[PDB]
Amino acid sequence: KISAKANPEADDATEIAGNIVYHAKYSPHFSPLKFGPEQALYATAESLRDRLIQLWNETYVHFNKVDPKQTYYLSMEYLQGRALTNAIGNLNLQGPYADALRTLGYELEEIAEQEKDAALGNGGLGRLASCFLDSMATLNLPAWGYGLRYRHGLFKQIITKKGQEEIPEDWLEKFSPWEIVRHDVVFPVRFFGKVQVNPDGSRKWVDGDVVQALAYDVPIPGYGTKNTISLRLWEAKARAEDLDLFQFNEGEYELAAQLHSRAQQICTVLYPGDATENGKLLRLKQQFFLCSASLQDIISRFHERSTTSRKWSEFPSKVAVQMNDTHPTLAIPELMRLLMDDNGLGWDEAWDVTSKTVAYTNHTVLPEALEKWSQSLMWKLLPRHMEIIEEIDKRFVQTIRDTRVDLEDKISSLSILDNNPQKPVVRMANLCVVSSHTVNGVAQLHSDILKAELFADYVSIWPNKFQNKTNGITPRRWLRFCSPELSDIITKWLKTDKWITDLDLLTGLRQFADNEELQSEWASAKTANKKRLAQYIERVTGVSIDPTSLFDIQVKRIHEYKRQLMNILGVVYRFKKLKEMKPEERKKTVPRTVMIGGKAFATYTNAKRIVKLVNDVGDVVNSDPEVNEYLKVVFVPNYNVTVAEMLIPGSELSQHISTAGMEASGTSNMKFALNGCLIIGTLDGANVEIREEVGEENFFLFGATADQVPRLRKEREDGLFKPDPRFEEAKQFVKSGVFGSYDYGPLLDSLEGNTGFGRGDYFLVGYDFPSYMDAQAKVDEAYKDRKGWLKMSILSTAGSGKFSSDRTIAQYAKEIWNIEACPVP
Amino acid sequence: KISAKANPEADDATEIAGNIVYHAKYSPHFSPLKFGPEQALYATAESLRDRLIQLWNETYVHFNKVDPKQTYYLSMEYLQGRALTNAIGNLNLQGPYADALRTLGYELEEIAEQEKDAALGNGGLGRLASCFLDSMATLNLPAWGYGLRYRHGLFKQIITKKGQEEIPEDWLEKFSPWEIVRHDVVFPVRFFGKVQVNPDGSRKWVDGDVVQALAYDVPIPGYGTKNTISLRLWEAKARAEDLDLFQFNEGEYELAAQLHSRAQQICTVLYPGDATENGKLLRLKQQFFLCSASLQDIISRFHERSTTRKWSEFPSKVAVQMNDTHPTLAIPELMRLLMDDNGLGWDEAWDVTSKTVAYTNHTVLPEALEKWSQSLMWKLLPRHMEIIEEIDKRFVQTIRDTRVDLEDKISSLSILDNNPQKPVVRMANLCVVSSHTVNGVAQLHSDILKAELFADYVSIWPNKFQNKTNGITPRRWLRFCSPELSDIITKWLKTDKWITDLDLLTGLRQFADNEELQSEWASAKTANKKRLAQYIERVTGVSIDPTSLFDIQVKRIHEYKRQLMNILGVVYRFKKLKEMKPEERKKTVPRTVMIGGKAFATYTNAKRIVKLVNDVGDVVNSDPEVNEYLKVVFVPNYNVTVAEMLIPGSELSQHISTAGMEASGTSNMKFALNGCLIIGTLDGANVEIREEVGEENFFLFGATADQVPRLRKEREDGLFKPDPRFEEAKQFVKSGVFGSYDYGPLLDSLEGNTGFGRGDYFLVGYDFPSYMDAQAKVDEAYKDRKGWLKMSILSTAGSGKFSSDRTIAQYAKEIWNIEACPVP
Ligand SMILES: *Cc1c(COP(=O)(O)O)cnc(C)c1O
Ligand SMILES: *Cc1c(COP(=O)(O)O)cnc(C)c1O
């Protein structure tokens, strides 16, 4: 009944419904007869894209005219998630789009579930970049992100009898309705080759392989603003002419298409396995490709904004480049190359530009994690860059000899090049610190450790280089849009919706935390979210969960330091206790549904064993009629932004239980706190700040602290460790065969012995187990006291304002980038 | 200045311009600032696509409701060309689109030149399929074409100083604005594997590789009708899940992506080189992929039209036409789908298959008919080999039961050739045995099929063999490529109804001596020649004189096509001009010779011939003594667009293949339709063209087909007496006048009396004197302007028979038994 009527500016239900039908008919991607939920998704996304194109174009023109200083964020990951709800929400068209879809015979949630997550990232590094983009838009800042257009993500996780299996993501196998290809925005990127030296001393990288970098824009709308910025993604392509017809017609198909193959490899997956030389080279190719394409584009834009060609001295006053971790380190020597070789600048001029343009964000505690590459591999793949890095290092060392002779003895550790006789490498973090005008960590304690310990000598050389910028999360995706009913309650009680862009207003809830009407609304909202989560879990796992039970969630990368193993051993203990109780005693317990999710790196044997263990435990627990009214255990598969958007709103307790000292941050922790989920956790990462903000009384702390961990490991080494019998009992119960034929002995050996690699319980699972189980008992007692629990939940949201990514990005803008709002009129 | 305003039904200049600006903004594929001619092309194409989607949808719905018998044309090639002018033309929106683009600051010609030809074919076989689609639409017939969505065509031809170089086509490297992907229309296609025998006795093809066939529609609009049919093209794809992450993460990238690689190979190029086993297998994969995907889709559509269906209805509702033997596997594939997937018994399945499928043959030489190793067929398509063996077993039994007189010919009539050295499957035999109808493509060709090639099959099935003379669409090939000439025709016939009733062109005959018509005719040709001269200068750098006789030869470069004869005649003409006193040169007819065509990359002498033409041109065109009287240009990258530029400006075209070697000749028909006279042998479509236009309006020369064997024997026996002009031309090439390239090796092909690659098998020497004498007749005729213009008018006037509308009407009535289904 609704006829096709194009209206790219559609802003009421009738206009929008017409525009959707228009796209279904005139932007077809399927046979015309059926308009199923899939077709409806694409046509709805296309209708929204019309609004986004108008705004993206206006923002591009405005920034071009104003010629502001502009930030470019380089990241190897973006966890964009699904775009639909966010687009609708930022445009403030929820009502009109819901009504439009209803007139076409669909509920918006049916359609939203058809959208595949954009598989452009893996973990928190990527989700940080994605929150930052939302905040850049909303704060009206002239800032873009650049990334790679990965076709297959990291992997889609499936759970079989074997445990985790890894399959390629398929988000682009039909098409993405959000992106906009820019066929005119193509830049050449070279690999391998050699350096031509001209008679005048100029140098030019030549030969090797050349791939084409093709731009795709993903519009990022801001909340309550026209400003719509870009995540510009690069696809690596060979040219049609790079196919060798002679070889193809000789039947040598692989040889014929070898450049196409090498191009496709770049954007196949995130973090391609690098145990082999081929894989190391591919990782470096991906990093270089991102850096080179992006910087070429940035330079082109700098010039196109000229009104006269413009002075290079203006460049660092008009461009900021932020490196998210060390992955984009090659931006340093690449910008040098582009300035000196392609644009003729002398070294000193080029260095002044580069050093004032680039800043570095570090995310880590362990020096062992910081990227290093073989000098031989770098010479092979990127010879001109190795020449430039050698000169950076030569000049840096000379600075020490000229100005800081007291540090002469530390040249070997401070240099970018490690000339170890066996394994010479380039220390990428050293290159970043030496070259960047600013270095920042991602939480106060993390940033303090970077200054005091990891990079102390560099701090001595450059006393103002190092900063802190505490991470944050966007309260659009992570509260307003994922939990709209709770959001409406917040708005009602605060008497304003301005908290959506001024998150510290949430503190206005504190005065009402004992208000029984608010507690009742809060409980009702959580209940509706729990019911939705239970529906989701049943659909994706087949397990029916009881929404009156305590929902206890641990979702993050599977790793020994994250201690999913501790959680599951506690579950095994709780199960064994329940089995041993008489029914009268079981009725005294707090019923609980334990949900654990996350991905294991495919070659990480114990992480895969842990996924297998969680599933095997669940299979037994969930099917035992004697305890399954009190305990169920589910492994939630394929954790990604969409899964997070389902879990977080329905969560009551979340676990952030990593060995103390091993986490720099913890943005998921923030998301949970913001949504009224209480935390059981170690004094570690973002838990420190969350506990400070929400109050110690509204958090369940346990475990060794960071400063104790070395003593405790030494006590274990010295034979002084006294394991709690409940821990031994849990381990032995896993080893008893109760969970089936799989032998968990090898996994649990990691907890045995007193010393040795892969042994001796390095992550203190045994040591922390008793205080962990005691904190879980406190959780149970707290959960029985409903009024008390709801007060804690309200106070958790109420104290969450500091964690806004708007606060984070405003700080980067003022203190690092020196950019300011540029609102599109 | 002009505001974006969507209107998918735009039919006036203002509405159209708004819609173009709307697509430029809201269907972007580039940065938004610049609206250059490329961006304008895509936005204009998208505007037209809106009109085409409406009509394609209406046609699909109407055919679904009516449930007519529907034809499906299977072809390994389609030469679609550029779509823009044809779309505008068939929608009758020329004025409104021209005006709309002008308001946006462009002439339609600037935009039309930005469009890349759809590189979906190579030669006449493919252009025939494409003309047929246009006629199917225009005649309101329920008929589709299926094909492969080739990414890189055959090759784009580049001319360097070294001669031809071959590079992949790039028409899809950005995107094609015409096509419509159908992500729901995906069928699995298997390769390799084995035949499972089920407990009940049924059989199932299992294991091996499975690729996904994804459909894209290319709407084909009809002239003066809403009817808009499809060219449905298949892309071979692997699934994301077919990438092996373990291998990829181990750095074994080729292994990890091997299924993706094998899928991509299917649609990389036309006619992938097959000197190796790999290449033979890839050719068979392509053919099977086309057949299997298309048949699965056809069967799906047959069922979807059910209102409540019986398999007995299938041959009453489906016709499948095989364009050459490339789609031969449609026969055993339909059998497999019917018997295995749908449970039919052999006899029922065979009745359906044999009544559904018909075969069009295009070949003179039996050596050209496709044969495949039995071993390769078993390896790639084991279930199909089981089926082919049973077809053959039953056929041979029919001979033994009903035609005992042919028992001694079973070895040559069987589909399987069990020659102990090289056992093969004879695909043409499988096609003739299985198809209810077989046709050739010209009367003489069809007569030869019946009398010689397939005489015994004709004896077995006296009504199976037919003729359907080829044709060309007078939309693309007259109305749209030559609008000014078309307006003259309309004026003089007092109607434009000839555009769909081409025999009305005979009404020009009465005016062929008319001084006013001759004047308008000459003016139109002159304007086309000036446009061609502009084009030639742009693409070759050579300035040509539009007052000279434009002499064109464009087709595949091959020894049997005799470009070598043409260029030797040019060399001779050049030498004579150089030797003449200026007073004698002023008595000659100035001529510009244009030669174009592609050489298969491994075909050494064909590449040498391209090199020769360019080398001769380099010398002739820069010689100030003679270049006012003769130039010779190699026109690069011959394709539909090049034909659209050359044909309208042509005055003489050469169709000079050794007699007996051409079945047809559709380009010949295009030239005749545009008033271009032919110098040619009595061969292929020249025979019919000469009949229709009159012998006095055609320049015939050369041996006839029946003489060729005698002439080759005379050469073998040492009795050949070469004309001194031929020897003089050859020696001049060998003299080094055309530079450092040694043409000795090429010309050795013309030397000796016997042996493969020697002895002038294609009779270049023998036919040279009559060819040169015919060229002298051309010159004398060209000096008599009134006489020439009369011939030109009579050529167009007699061209009606060559309409593809006539051809397709005949297939529809005599083979397919389908009829008009006009969309209201
Ligand atoms: C927020 C989020 C993260 C954050 O990572 P952690 O470091 O685990 O706190 C990771 N993945 C997803 C899908 C997220 O939404
Ligand atoms: C018409 C046409 C042909 C026809 O081929 P013949 O050479 O006459 O067999 C081939 N190529 C193109 C581009 C055509 O337009």
Q: Among B158, B157, B161, which Cα is nearest to B617's?
A: B161
Would you give the distance in Å from CA A65 to the centre of its chain? 33
Amino acid identity at B706: D
Reduce the DSSP state of residue B724 to 3 states and report it: helix
CA dihedral A527, A533, A535, A537 (to 10 degrees): -140
Nearest beta carbon to residue B180 from set A28, A278, A282: A28
Distance between first and last Cα of chain B: 38
Tokens of A40: 């409806």
Cα angle B456, B459, B465 (rounded to 5 degrees) comes to: 95
Alpha helices per DSSP H over A161-236: none
Strands (E), B513-559: 549-554
- Enter the tokens of residue A619: 């299979």
C-beta of A667 in contact with ligand 1 (< 6 A): yes
Q: Where are the beta strands (DSSP E) in A623-699?
A: 631-636, 653-656, 678-681
Asked if B264 lies within 8 A of A257 by C-beta distance, the reply is yes
Distances from the Cα of B720 to the Cα of B258, B565, B753, angstroms = 57, 17, 9
Q: Are B435 and B354 in contact (CB under 8 A)?
A: yes
Contact present, B256 and B247 (Cβ < 8 Å): yes
Q: Is B511 in contact with B793 (CB distance < 8 Å)?
A: yes
Nearest alpha carbon to residue A698 among A672, A717, A729 = A672
* A661: β partners: none
The amino acid present at A591, given as its one-letter code, is: P
- What own/partner pairs with CB < 8 Å and gap ≥ 24 does A239-247 have? A239/A212, A239/B170, A239/B173, A240/B152, A240/B167, A240/B168, A240/B169, A240/B170, A240/B173, A241/B167, A241/B168, A241/B170, A243/B152, A243/B168, A243/B268, A245/B152, A245/B155, A245/B166, A245/B167, A245/B168, A245/B269, A245/B601, A246/B166, A246/B601
A764 SS3 class: coil
β-sheet bridge partners, residue B465: B438
Chain B interface, best mutation among A248, A286, A300, by max B CB count within 10 A: A248
CA A577 from centre of chain: 38
Half-sphere exposure of A575 toward its Cβ, with a 13 Å CA cutoff? 28
Which residues does B521 contact at the CB level (< 8 Å), separation at least 6? Answer: B485, B488, B675, B789, B792, B793
- Which of B515, B475, B513, B511 shows the shortest CA–CA distance to B491? B511
Alpha helices in B337-465 (DSSP H): 346-356, 374-380, 382-402, 410-413, 427-434, 443-448, 455-460
- Looking at the annotation, which residues of B are catalytic? 362, 555-556, 561, 666, 670
Return d(Cα B652, Cα B645) in angstroms, integer.
Answer: 15
| Crossing angle of helices B515-540 and B483-493, rounded to 10° | 170
Beta carbons within 10 angstroms of residue B565's beta carbon: 27
What are A197's strand-pairing partners? A203
Q: How far apart are CA A446 and CA A452, in angstroms?
A: 10
Angle between helices B563-579 and B604-620 (to 10 degrees): 20
The rounded distance, in Å, linking the Cα atoms of B621 and B628 is: 9
Q: In the numeric block, which tokens belong to residue A443? A: 């939480």
- Residue B466 dihedral angles phi and psi, to the nearest 5°: -135, 170
* Residue pair B597/B556 in contact by the 8 Å Cβ criterion: yes
Q: Which atom of ligand 1 is nearest to the CA of A473?
A: 1
**Chain A nearest C-alpha distance from B364 (Å):** 26
Q: Which residue reads 């296609």 in tokens?
A: B189
Do A137 and A220 contact (CB within 8 A), yes or no?
A: yes
3-state secondary structure of B162: coil
Sequence-ordered list of residues with C-beta below 8 angstroms from that of A253, at least 6 positions apart, any chain: A247, B261, B265, B278, B282
- Nearest alpha carbon to residue B392 among B365, B411, B369: B411
Which tokens hold the place of A220? 């990022």
Resolution of this entry, Å: 1.7
Taking a C-beta distance cutoff of 8 angstroms, is the pair A506, A801 a contact?
yes
Cα A479 from Cα A475, distance rounded (Å): 5
Q: How many CA atoms lie within 13 A of B107 on its CB side?
A: 3
A444 Cβ contact list (under 8 Å, min separation 6): A468, A470, A689
Burial of B554 (0-12, 13-18, 19+ CB in 10 A): buried
| Per-residue burial over B234-262, b = 16 or more CB atoms within 10 Å of its CB, e = otherwise | bbbbbbbebbbbebbbbbbbeebbbbbbb
The count of residues in chain A is 825
Give the pair of three-digit tokens for residue B501.
């009733």
User: Strand pairing partners for A356?
Assistant: none
The finding on whether B120 has its CB within 6 A of some atom of ligand 2 is no
Partners of A53 on chain B (C-beta within 8 Å) are 25-26, 28
In Å, how far from its chain's centre is CA B504? 26
Sign (positive or negative) of CA dihedral A137, A143, A149, A153: negative
Q: Mapped to the 3 state alphabet, what secondary structure does B79-124 carry?
A: CCECCHHHHHHHCCCHHHHHHHHHHCCCCHHHHHCCCCCECCCCCH
Rounded-to-integer distance, Cα A171 and Cα A168, Å: 9
Q: How far is the CA of B797 from the centre of ligand 2 (A)?
A: 22
Order of all β-strands in the sheet with B591-596? B630-635, B591-596, B549-554, B652-655, B677-680, B699-700
Give strand pairing partners of B118: B81
d(CA A561, CA A795): 29
Nearest residue to B700 via CA among B718, B685, B681, B715 = B681
Rounded CA gap, A619 and A626, in Å?
A: 14
Q: Determine how β-strand B630-635 pairs with β-strand B591-596.
A: parallel
Region label for B2, one of left (φ > 0), alpha (ψ between -120 and 50) or beta (otherwise):
beta
According to the entry, how was the structure determined? X-ray
> What number of CA atoms fall less than 13 Å from residue B414's CA on the CB side?
21
User: What is d(CA B191, CA B265) in angstroms, rounded to the nearest whole number?
Assistant: 13
| DSSP secondary structure letter of residue A473 | B
Q: Which residues of A313-340 are buried (b: 16+ CB within 10 A; e: fewer)?
A: eebbebbbbbbbbbbbbbbbbbbbbbbb
DSSP state of A652: S
Pairing of strands B70-74, B143-148: parallel
Q: Please, what is the Cα angle at B87 between B81 and B91, to 5 degrees?
A: 155
Q: Which residues of A are catalytic?
A: 363, 556-557, 562, 667, 671
Q: How many CA atoms within 13 Å lie on the side-chain side of B199?
A: 0
Phi, psi of A198 (to 5 degrees): -85, 160
Instruction: Report the distance separating Cα B684 and Cα B379, nearest Å.
Output: 39
Which is it for the CA torsion A200, A204, A208, A210, positive or negative?
Answer: negative
Cβ distance A192 to A204 under 8 Å?
A: no
Per the CB < 8 A criterion, the answer to whether A784 and A590 are in contact is: yes
Tell me, using a 6 A CB cutoff, whether residue A471 lines ligand 1: no
Closest CA to A614 of A566, A682, A568, A546: A568
Helices (H), A505-656: 516-541, 564-580, 583-586, 605-622, 641-647
Instruction: Tally the C-alpha atoms within 13 A of residue B155's C-alpha that lie toward its C-beta.
Output: 26
Distance CA B20, CA B103 (A): 11
B574-589 core/surface letters (b: 16 or more CB in 10 A; e: else) = bbbbeebeeeebeebb
* Dihedral pair phi/psi, residue B519, rounded to 5°: -60, -45
Q: Quick one: DSSP state of residue A700?
A: E
Residue B733, phi then psi, degrees to nearest 5: -60, -40
- Summarize chain A as % helix, strand, coil (round to 5): 50, 15, 35
Chain B residues close to A4, C-beta within 8 Å: 8
Residue A657, Ramachandran bin (φ over 0: left; ψ between -120 and 50: alpha; else beta): alpha
Cα–Cα distance, A667 to A656 (Å, whole number): 11
Element (H, E) at A719: none
Q: Domains, chain B, ranges and CATH?
A: 1-471+804-824 (3.40.50.2000), 472-803 (3.40.50.2000)
Give B796 Cα–ligand 2 centroid separation in angstroms. Answer: 18
Give the residue, by CA position, lying nearest to ligand 1 atom 3: A124
Q: Provide, as residue numbers in chain A, all residues whose Cβ is less than 8 Å from the Cβ of B170.
A: 239-241
What residue type is B532 in one-letter code?
L
The residue type at B398: T
Q: Give the distance, in angstroms, between the CA of residue A638 and the centroid of all CA atoms in the same chain.
A: 15
Rounded CA-CA distance A748/A727 in Å is 12
- What count of other Cβ atoms lies within 10 Å of the Cβ of residue B742? 11
Nearest-CA distance from B355 to chain A in Å? Answer: 29
Angle subtended by helix axes A124-138 and A805-812, to nearest 10: 80
Determine if ligand 2 sits within 6 Å of the CB of residue B79. Answer: yes
- A600 with A611: CB under 8 angstroms? yes
Which residue(s) pair with B654 in the sheet?
B679
User: DSSP assignment of A449-468, as one string?
Assistant: HIIIIITHHHHHH-TTSEEE
Closest-CA residue to B636 (of B164, B290, B265, B203): B164
First to last CA, chain A: 38
Q: Are A124 and A51 in contact (CB under 8 A)?
A: no
B305 CA → ligand 1 middle, Å: 50
Nearest residue to B398 (alpha-carbon basis) of B459, B355, B325, B454 = B459
Q: Label residues B746-757 b or e (16+ Cβ within 10 Å = b).
A: bbebbeeeeeee
User: Radius of gyration of chain A from Cα atoms?
Assistant: 28
> Strand order in B228-237's β-sheet?
B180-191, B209-221, B228-237, B143-148, B70-74, B318-323, B357-360, B437-440, B465-467
Put simply, the answer to whether B29 touches A183 (Cβ < 8 Å) is yes
